[PDB]
């Protein structure tokens, strides 16, 4: 029925990769909208994530209220970044 | 019912270009991606070409890779090949499949186009 | 890709027709359909999505598809049965379509 693998199509460069880490998962599954948010932050060195799963809701637009977002994982690497894209999973037709 | 018309078939030189033409007809030529499938008589069909609905990627038989663009447009209802530098394995049955994504189906097979070289 | 299980011949006269049976692990992926080779050379839509007939078919049972192989449509031996049958399989997603070599069926 259910086994969720997948294909990346993401990259086709695989040159001079640096460094490789495994985390444990972020996302895990609750009837209304979990909010799940993400702060990417750019500090000179680190790079740190602040997360919140939040509990169930049925607002539209963004809810009010206060949401603490905790410090994970800082990222020891260093380099510019001036852009960003997100990546998506679907069995999307051609 | 509707039909498709494929033609450009012929007998050709090898290694040099020759292009197949498959005009749509009866439905709306932007909403479907078509493909095509080569076959020589006496062993199975093999699908060699496929774009989009409106050909945003060009994707192919991985054995026939970077030889070969194909191309519509519609407003002229038709989607044709160009043959370059081939090395005599066109000697095959060519079909243009309606495909309408009931997770990649093929509707309408064509009559079949005949590509043969003389060597 | 990988070419499709398949039998290259049936040639089959009980009033049963057995079972043509064609496998894939990408079978298991995504469901495989069939295509006749008819003389006159026109292919045909015989089974999809391994369960509903198409508009204008002859009047047959369904495929089952049970596991990593199709058992598939048939029925009894008619006069049209001669025609025989390709596999057909989508890859994952990276749209491959792979045929086998066809098989043969024979009164």
């Known amino acids: 029925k259910s086994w969720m693998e997948s294909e990346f199509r993401v990259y086709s460069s695989a040159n001079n990769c640096t460094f490789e880490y495994v985390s444990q998962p972020f996302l895990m599954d609750g009837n209304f909208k979990n909010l799940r948010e993400f702060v990417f932050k750019n500090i000179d060195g680190y790079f740190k994530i602040y997360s919140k799963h939040t509990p169930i809701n049925l607002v539209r637009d963004l809810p009010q209220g206060f949401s603490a977002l905790e410090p994970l994982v800082d990222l020891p690497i260093g380099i510019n970044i001036t852009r960003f894209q997100t990546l998506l999973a679907l069995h999307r037709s051609y | 019912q509707v039909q498709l018309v494929e033609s450009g078939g012929g007998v050709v030189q090898p290694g040099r270009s020759l292009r197949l033409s498959c005009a749509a007809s009866?439905?709306?030529?932007?909403?479907?991606?078509m493909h095509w499938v080569r076959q020589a008589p006496g062993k199975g069909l093999e699908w060699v070409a496929v774009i989009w609905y409106d050909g945003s990627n060009k994707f192919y038989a991985d054995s026939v890779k970077g030889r070969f663009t194909i191309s519509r447009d519609n407003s002229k209802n038709t989607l044709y090949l160009q043959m370059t530098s081939l090395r005599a394995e066109d000697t095959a049955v060519y079909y243009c499949?309606?495909?309408?994504?009931?997770?990649?189906?093929?509707?309408?097979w064509g009559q079949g186009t005949l590509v043969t070289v003389s060597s | 890709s990988y070419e499709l299980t398949q039998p290259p011949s049936v040639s089959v006269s009980p009033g049963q027709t057995a079972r043509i049976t064609c496998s894939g692990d990408a079978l298991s992926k995504h469901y495989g359909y069939w295509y006749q080779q008819k003389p006159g050379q026109a292919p045909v839509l015989v089974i999809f999505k391994d369960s509903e007939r198409p508009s204008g078919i002859p009047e047959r049972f369904s495929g089952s598809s049970s596991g990593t192989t199709i058992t598939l449509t048939v029925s009894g031996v008619q006069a049209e049965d001669e025609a025989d049958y390709y596999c057909?399989?989508?890859?994952?997603?990276?749209?491959?379509?792979?045929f086998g070599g066809g098989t043969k069926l024979t009164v």
């Open positions: 499949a309606r495909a309408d994504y009931g997770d990649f189906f093929f509707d309408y």
């Open positions: 009866g439905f709306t030529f932007s909403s479907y991606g």
């Open positions: 057909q399989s989508a890859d994952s997603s990276a749209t491959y379509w792979v």
